[PDB]
């Protein structure tokens, strides 16, 4: 059946996507320190296929770790627009989610959402390195439930 063939093919692509996420570190504030602890051998982010890779031309997901200051807000959008785009954005910490501690400041945007679309939200201040691992695991589940080929077959 055509639907079955597109079903297996979609799963193959989705497996290839979720099993290789290459974060482009936007290390901004104390949320970045905890994320490096995820890369530390205690949790070993690398072991899940997900390994840190620079050059957003060669990265799949953004991990917004820290406050997003209005001065650098154009930089966040520019590095987001340059990713080969099967692409997702992970927001770490209360500050990146909706402003957090500095929600009422004059120079902190109330959440990274106002600049970029945001996938799974990671709450914390900072979210423990284990909590982020759960977040990345959630994105892998979200990638697993992608029906890109099924929608194309039913267009």
């Amino acid at each position: 059946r055509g639907e079955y063939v597109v079903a297996k093919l979609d799963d193959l692509v989705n497996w290839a996507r979720r099993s290789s996420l290459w974060p482009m570190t936007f290390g901004l504030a104390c949320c970045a320190v905890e994320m490096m602890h995820m890369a530390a051998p205690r949790y070993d982010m690398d072991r899940f296929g997900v390994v840190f890779r620079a050059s957003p031309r060669q990265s799949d997901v953004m991990i917004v770790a820290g406050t997003l200051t209005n001065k650098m807000a154009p930089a966040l959008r520019k590095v987001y627009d340059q990713m080969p785009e099967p692409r997702y954005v992970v927001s770490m910490g209360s500050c990146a989610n909706g402003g957090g501690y500095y929600h009422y400041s004059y120079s902190v945007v109330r959440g990274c959402d106002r600049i970029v679309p945001v996938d799974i939200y990671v709450p914390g201040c900072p979210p423990t390195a284990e909590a982020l691992l759960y977040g990345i695991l959630q994105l892998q589940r979200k990638i697993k439930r992608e029906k890109r080929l099924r929608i194309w077959y039913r267009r």
């Binding site: 051998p41 205690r42 945001v118 939200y121 709450p123 914390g124 979210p127 759960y134 979200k142």
Partner: protein, 176 residues
């Protein structure tokens, strides 16, 4: 009391110069660096198999918030607004009103979990141990709105993590 970290003058005798020359040509400190990387290769990796092996925590851990209730069943919050008054990030919003039966509780108790700093000041300020930070730290969500907890979601957390929060404060109340 100070110590000179780098004030070592090498000896100029025929022995020492040859060793430095032998170190130079026959790369030794590079081999010592190589030799020790081999030592760590054969060692025991410290990686914990997440999520089958969750990390070690303490009873004082601060995570997802929850409102607890008395053993009778009635909530502990009596709407003194101490938690809202001391919240450093003003993530707490409270609205109270006389209940039908008398003793009155909150009609709105919203915690902005994207504005919360998880400092734990709310659970200290609470004179009835009503608002606490539970042991959960895996409540990541796909949408920003799902983080903005209100009274109903928080009360649900209190009725879900009660079997764990009760033991934690049971082990830590004496320290406080």
């Amino acid at each position: 009391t100070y110590k000179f970290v780098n004030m070592r003058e090498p000896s100029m005798d025929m022995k020492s110069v040859t060793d430095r020359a032998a170190q130079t040509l026959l790369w030794t400190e590079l081999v010592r660096g190589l030799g020790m990387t081999l030592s760590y290769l054969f060692r025991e990796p410290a990686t914990i198999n997440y999520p089958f092996e969750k990390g070690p925590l303490s009873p004082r851990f601060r995570g997802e918030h929850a409102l607890r209730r008395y053993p009778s069943g009635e909530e502990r919050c009596i709407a003194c607004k101490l938690c809202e008054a001391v919240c450093p990030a003003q993530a707490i919003t409270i609205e109270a009103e006389p209940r039908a039966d008398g003793s009155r509780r909150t009609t709105r108790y919203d915690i902005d979990m994207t504005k919360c700093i998880y400092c734990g000041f709310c659970q200290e300020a609470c004179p009835v141990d009503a608002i606490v930070e539970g042991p959960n730290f895996e409540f990541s969500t796909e949408t920003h709105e799902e983080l903005l907890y209100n009274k109903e979601k928080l009360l649900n957390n209190g009725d879900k993590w009660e079997a764990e929060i009760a033991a934690n404060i049971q082990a830590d109340y004496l320290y406080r």
